[PDB]
Design a binder for this molecule. Structure first.
Ligand SMILES: Nc1nc2c(ncn2[C@@H]2O[C@H](COP(=O)(O)OP(=O)(O)OP(=O)(O)O)[C@@H](O)[C@H]2O)c(=O)[nH]1
Ligand SMILES: [Mg+2]
Lengths: 138, 173, 1052
């Protein structure tokens, strides 16, 4: 698990790929060949699905690239413990290991939490990292 | 004494001028369309076998409403790039107008015509339909601002004409 | 601006020094301040005297430029206020101003002459200033011998010409002719005199270029005056002699040759009969040949000469071409062949020299194009042989050709990185390959054995080279290029493109096969065709084989070489380009030389009937051979996207027409390709998404060919049954939510959805109700999949894509009940998507991108839902569901914006009655979308909204609010004048006349000087006079709005 290999030619322009060690969403994928009769080589460039930094690489087609296994899950927010989100699965389980995200999203979580709204939190687990990435409120 | 030339980027609104320059500059392609107001001058450095060259590309506005001074920006311009959208025929019909304004404020400065967005399937303006390259100082290129396609070609041709060395080629720093 | 104070001139000059300063050293506040100084100065009321003073005193060229611009804009803004005497005095002031300053800065001079031309044309609009006064002044300016004054007159004429490009046409018939006659006279006087001075040669340049622009004017009117101007022989001989004199200028030569080409392009009703065309064409060919045969073509003249020749051949009809003297026609065609081969070799040299300006490639392209137009018993056979041999010599490698020869043999330089956007040779050089193919058809007796010999030699060379590459690296690519061009030429020789109809065997090929069918043993021919692995030279009597079938067998032997290289691990040594060539060729073969219908030809040769006939075993062999080819390519060529897609397209070609699908489904390779694809085996799962979609389309398409019930059930249960079984078992894996994220499940669901897209794409008229009933269950399961993959963007987007595919491909053939079921499914899917994405907020990593894609597909779904209980209510529920998702930033994606506004404006124009019946937030969102589309964004969007307002005038508060906006669109200053804007303005004016009189009176009260109030009053009165509370009521309101704009458009 964690990552599965896939021939570079088969990479979707809408999918993900591991670039320079980080899981990235592919934002551009262009093909070129050296000669007129040369074989194809792909120029990938993607955004780190967590940090947001741009990583790019050029590798020939037919060569295998590592594709990260991406999971995204919805927990309902039931607590904020000293900065650790207390999240409730629909199966009844509560996970208090994930921290609160920095930036305006953590500000939205604290504001909507002190206000008492039922807040749904989407956490993104990629390879070895997990992070809260989305908020849905009704 | 740095070697630099003034380049004026003209064309109909939404043909991908700001996209062309910004991708030429940062490396990111913006899918959203934010219309340019007046002009924005961006310096572009190219390392050649004869040294560095700087093109201060004046990214001008396509819409008449946001034109600003329009042809007033063409004064003392040393070279130009006219851009049109190969998927929008009206942007091609307007190319002789831009050519007229450039040739009025400037004169025989070398101009490069660029048909952008060749990466889109339904292409209305065919490549063989162009007669603009038939001149000693005029040239046409097929470019795609997305895929970084024929990006350096207008600047290499313009550099060869402005310097006068057809053996000039771009190299890595 | 004040006339006198030093602050005005000082402001303008300081602003000029700021704007002309190096931009990196001037803050944007200072820049915007300066350009605001100039822009506000140009918008002032009556700056004519002020600008006169600036032009007479300021010494800063930028300020003079901006002053001329101010005169230019003010004379049109306040045209109705100025008197004819003051306007003419201003025009003469500009003319004399630039006249008395010969060393004036160029762009200042040209800006002032632009002001003069604008004054003249604006005078032509109101019939105030005629062109004959400026023409007399120009004539007097030319009559003086001063080359600078002559240059000035030529500049004035060029300004008039550019400015005039009813007014344009009335200028076309009269004034343009006088300009052309002035230019022609100047060119005559210059051609007579020998040895021009340095300045006289420049006046000659500028007037020759002026003639070039005059002739190149769009649509010269067909009058007897233009007849006497153009059809006179002294003009043709004039430009021929002029070109002969300034030939070595390389710059005036192009202007003269473009003049001659434009004279050669005459074709309209300007020719009174067909005989004058023969006289004109004959004299033109005479002067052209006399000019060419005693002149070295050089570099600057090639494209001009070729453009003249191709103009003559393409423009004049064939009956006029054949009415000239036979000797003149023979000399013309001989010259065409000579220049064709010379330009061919020159262009082939330009390829290897890697020159920046390609001149001979364009000219050679024009000449080959003219050849194709000209040729399409045997007259051109010798010429066709010459041009064909020159093409084959220019595209073959060093030993037998001059493709890579520079008179040295350097073989070009380093391999140039080729992008995927670069067009293939068979597309870029399609016209040349078609021309050379036709010339090869009329001269087939020589060309076909040549192509067969070259193809056999290159085949053996490639076999030996590949065997050697196991135990000259550029020699392999040169060989690949040889086989490349040979395959292209052969393909365009043996069949056509048509792209709309069924391609037939070209008549020359069938005639050649019928005439020689007695000299060929069909058994040895079938042995050559049936054995593409062994050499043709070693077979019992290969010489007596049908030349056509031997050529097709040559390319087939190339295909066997490639396939045998695939059988070994030598796939890495092959050329994917050559693979594309062979696949394209076999595709073309399948459409012409497979299952020939004898009802489409008067007579078919016996060799082509027995080998490619309907019930013959030759066709059953070729179809299976192509199947094996597709299996090989799909087995190894996953990494080359072009080659893979072309291969699967060859498959679709083998299955499209039922005559071929009935024979392809009996092959075992078809069924093991079905199983191998449905098994998701290692080799085929490396293919991209569109390749697998097309493959699914081919298999489903094959499922509707001739089969008995046994193999029918076996086929459907071998193709569509594994999809149902795997999909239903995955969604029943005791998992409702937890297991979906794992790749073993997500990849299988993705594969199923892609396959569904292929099935939908295989839809035809007889496929619906069967394919649709198969897809509907998958849709109803895709509802729950939409609920399960909430946070998985790619899978949601894919599901929506299958709904878009089914709705687009099938709804046109569906009935009413089925379309109702599809409508319910789509509405439910949009309900789930809206429920999961309503108040969701995300961080970064291109979330706006993903919601943009989803919304784009949804918009296409609603559009195809509007293709066909009121049919449009479900679409209203859809736009109601996804409208809150339409953020202001998502409308900055121009594609999504255009689709959304096209959809909602189509809903407002057609079926407008359902708009007031919408809820409050829906109605407010729609009205705000229309106001935002009119007031900002694109002109296409604004015109779409204005087009949506007219069928919405027949709740009332937003319609009353539109009247103010449309009044500001036209009466105030977007600034695009449109017929739809006038229609919406009319309907909104006659609707609420109270707010209309309120706005008109409000504007008439806020005016300054009563001189404007009077003409505004007459204008608005003339507007209300034609309105007088549809068709006849608005038809006159449109013309009165045109007069209003032409009388109030300045008053800004
Ligand atoms: N498909 C495709 N889209 C492009 C390309 N270049 C630009 N675009 C898109 O076209 C739209 C317009 O691009 P811009 O560069 O902002 O247009 P512009 O030249 O700045 O026009 P104005 O500022 O109005 O004068 C944007 O949505 C770009 O993302 C291209 O090469 N291919
Ligand atoms: Mg711009």
């Amino acid at each position: 698990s964690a990552t599965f290999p896939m021939q570079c030619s088969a990479l979707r322009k809408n999918g993900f790929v591991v670039l320079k060690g980080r899981p990235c969403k592919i934002v551009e994928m262009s093909t070129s060949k050296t000669g007129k009769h040369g074989h194809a080589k792909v120029h990938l460039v993607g955004i780190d699905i967590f940090t947001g930094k741009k990583y790019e690489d050029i590798c020939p087609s037919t060569h295998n690239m590592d594709v990260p296994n991406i999971k995204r899950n919805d927990f309902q927010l039931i607590g904020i413990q000293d900065g650790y989100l207390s999240l409730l699965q629909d199966s009844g389980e509560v996970r208090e290991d994930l921290r609160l995200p920095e930036g305006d999203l953590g500000k939205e979580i604290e504001q909507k939490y002190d206000c008492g709204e039922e807040i749904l939190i989407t956490v993104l687990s990629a390879m070895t990292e997990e992070a809260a990435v989305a908020i849905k409120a009704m | 004494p740095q070697v630099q030339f003034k380049l004026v980027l003209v064309g109909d609104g939404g043909t991908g001028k700001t996209t062309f320059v910004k991708r030429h500059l940062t490396g990111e392609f913006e899918k959203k369309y934010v219309a340019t107001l007046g002009v924005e001058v961006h310096p572009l450095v190219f390392h050649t076998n004869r040294g560095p060259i700087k093109f201060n590309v004046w990214d001008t506005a396509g819409l008449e409403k946001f034109g600003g001074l329009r042809d007033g920006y063409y004064i003392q311009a040393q070279c130009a790039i006219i851009m049109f959208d190969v998927t929008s025929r009206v942007t091609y019909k307007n190319v002789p107008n831009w050519h007229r304004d450039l040739v009025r404020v400037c004169e025989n400065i070398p101009i490069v015509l660029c048909g952008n967005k060749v990466d889109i399937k339904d292409r209305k303006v065919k490549a063989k339909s162009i007669v603009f390259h038939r001149k000693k100082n005029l040239q046409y290129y097929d470019i795609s601002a997305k895929s970084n396609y024929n990006f350096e070609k207008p600047f290499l041709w313009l550099a060869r004409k402005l310097i006068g060395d057809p053996n000039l080629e771009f190299v890595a720093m | 601006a004040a006339l006198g104070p030093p602050e005005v001139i000082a402001q303008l000059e300081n602003a000029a020094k700021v704007l002309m300063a190096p931009p990196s050293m001037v803050s944007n506040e200072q820049r915007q301040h300066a350009e605001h100084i100039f822009l506000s100065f140009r918008k002032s009321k009556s700056p004519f005297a002020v600008c006169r003073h600036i032009l007479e005193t300021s010494k800063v060229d930028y300020v003079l430029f901006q002053a001329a611009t101010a005169i230019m804009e003010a004379v049109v803004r306040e045209w109705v206020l100025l008197e004819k005497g003051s306007i003419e005095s201003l025009r003469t002031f500009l003319l004399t101003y630039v006249l008395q300053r010969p060393n004036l800065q160029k762009y200042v001079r040209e800006q002032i002459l632009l002001a003069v031309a604008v004054i003249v044309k604006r005078g032509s609009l109101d019939k105030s200033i005629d062109c004959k006064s400026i023409f007399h002044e120009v004539s007097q300016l030319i009559s003086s011998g001063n080359p600078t004054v002559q240059t000035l007159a030529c500049s004035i004429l060029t300004a008039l010409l550019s400015e005039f490009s009813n007014c344009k046409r009335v200028f076309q018939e009269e004034d343009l002719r006088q300009i052309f006659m002035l230019t022609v006279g100047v060119l005559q006087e210059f051609s007579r005199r020998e040895n021009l001075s340095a300045q006289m040669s420049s006046v000659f340049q500028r007037y020759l270029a002026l003639a070039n622009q005059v002739l190149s004017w769009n649509f010269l009117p067909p009058t007897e005056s233009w007849r006497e101007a153009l059809l006179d022989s002294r003009v043709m001989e004039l430009f021929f002699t002029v070109h002969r004199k300034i030939r070595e200028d390389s710059d005036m030569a192009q202007d003269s040759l473009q003049c001659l080409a434009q004279l050669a392009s005459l074709h309209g009703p300007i020719f009174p009969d067909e005989g004058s065309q023969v006289d004109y064409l004959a004299h033109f060919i005479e002067g052209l040949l006399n000019t060419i045969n005693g002149i070295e073509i050089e570099d600057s003249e090639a494209v001009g000469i070729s453009s003249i020749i191709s103009n003559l051949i393409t423009v004049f009809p064939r009956n006029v071409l054949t009415a000239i003297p036979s000797e003149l026609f023979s000399s013309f065609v001989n010259c065409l062949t000579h220049l064709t081969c010379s330009f061919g070799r020159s262009a082939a040299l330009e390829e290897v020299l890697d020159k920046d300006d390609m001149v001979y490639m364009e000219a050679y392209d024009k000449l080959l194009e003219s050849w194709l137009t000209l040729v399409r018993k045997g007259f051109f056979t010798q010429h066709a042989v010459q041009v064909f041999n020159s093409y084959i010599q220019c595209h073959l490698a060093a030993p037998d050709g001059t493709r890579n020869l520079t008179a040295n043999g350097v073989a070009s330089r380093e391999e140039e990185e080729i992008s995927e956007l670069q067009e293939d040779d068979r597309d870029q050089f399609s016209d040349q390959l078609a021309s050379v193919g036709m010339l090869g058809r009329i001269a087939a007796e020589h060309c076909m054995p040549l192509l067969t010999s070259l193809l056999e030699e290159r085949v053996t060379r490639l076999h030996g080279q590949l065997q050697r590459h196991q135990q000259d690296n550029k020699m392999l690519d040169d060989l690949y290029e040889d086989i490349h061009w040979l395959i292209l030429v052969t393909g365009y020789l043996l069949a056509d493109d048509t792209q709309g109809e069924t391609p037939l065997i070209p008549p020359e090929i069938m005639e050649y096969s019928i005439k020689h069918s007695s000299e060929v043993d069909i058994n040895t021919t079938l042995q050559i065709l049936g054995s593409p692995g062994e050499k043709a030279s070693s077979i019992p009597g290969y010489s007596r084989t049908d030349s056509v079938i031997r050529l097709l067998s040559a390319v087939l032997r190339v295909s066997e070489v490639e396939s045998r290289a695939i059988r070994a691990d030598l796939t890495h040594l092959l050329s994917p380009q050559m693979g594309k060539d062979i696949v394209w060729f076999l595709k073309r073969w399948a459409k012409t030389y497979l299952l020939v219908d004898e009802k489409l030809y008067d007579q078919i040769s016996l060799p082509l009937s027995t080998a490619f006939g309907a019930d013959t075993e030759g066709s059953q062999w070729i179809i299976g051979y192509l199947l094996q080819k597709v299996i090989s390519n799909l087995s190894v060529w996953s990494s080359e996207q072009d080659l893979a897609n072309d291969t699967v397209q060859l498959l679709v070609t083998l299955v499209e027409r039922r005559e071929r699908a009935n024979l392809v489904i009996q092959c075992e390779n078809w069924w093991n390709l079905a199983k191998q694809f449905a098994s998701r085996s290692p080799p085929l799962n490396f293919l991209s998404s569109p390749v697998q979609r097309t493959l699914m389309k081919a298999l489903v398409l094959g499922g509707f060919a001739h089969m008995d019930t046994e193999t029918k059930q076996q086929y459907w249960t071998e193709v569509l049954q594994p999809l149902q079984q795997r999909f239903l078992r995955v969604i029943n894996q005791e998992n409702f939510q937890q297991m979906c994220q794992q790749e073993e499940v997500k990849q299988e669901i993705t594969a199923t959805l892609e396959a569904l897209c292929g099935i939908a794409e295989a839809t035809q008229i007889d496929n619906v109700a069967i394919l649709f009933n198969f897809l509907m269950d998958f849709l109803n399961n895709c509802i729950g999949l939409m609920e399960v993959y909430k946070n998985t963007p790619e899978t949601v987007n894919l599901i929506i894509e299958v709904f878009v595919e089914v709705a687009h491909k099938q709804i046109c053939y569906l009935g009413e009940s089925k379309a109702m079921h599809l409508y319910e499914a789509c509405l439910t899917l949009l309900q789930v998507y809206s429920k999961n994405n309503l108040g969701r907020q995300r961080i970064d990593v291109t979330a706006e991108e993903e919601q943009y894609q989803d919304l784009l597909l949804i918009m296409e779904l609603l559009t195809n839902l509007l293709s066909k209980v009121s049919a449009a209510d479900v679409v209203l529920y859809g736009v109601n569901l996804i409208l809150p998702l339409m953020s202001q930033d998502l409308l900055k994606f121009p594609t999504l914006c255009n689709q959304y506004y096209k959809l909602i404006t189509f809903i407002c124009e057609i079926f407008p009655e359902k708009i007031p019946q919408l809820p409050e937030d829906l109605f407010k969102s729609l009205m705000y979308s229309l106001e935002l589309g009119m007031t900002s964004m694109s002109s296409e969007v604004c015109q779409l909204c204005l087009e949506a307002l007219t069928p919405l005038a027949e709740l009332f508060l937003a319609t009353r609010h539109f009247l103010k906006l449309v009044f500001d669109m036209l009466v105030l200053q977007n600034t695009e004048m449109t017929t739809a804007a006038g229609e919406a303005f009319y309907t909104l004016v006659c609707l609420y006349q109270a707010e209309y009189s309120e706005l008109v009176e409000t504007l008439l009260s806020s005016q300054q000087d009563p001189v404007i109030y009077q003409r505004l009053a007459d204008a608005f009165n003339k507007l209300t006079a034609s309105s007088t509370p549809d068709r006849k009521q608005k038809m006159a309101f449109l013309k009165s709005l045109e007069e209003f704009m032409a009388n109030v458009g300045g008053l800004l």
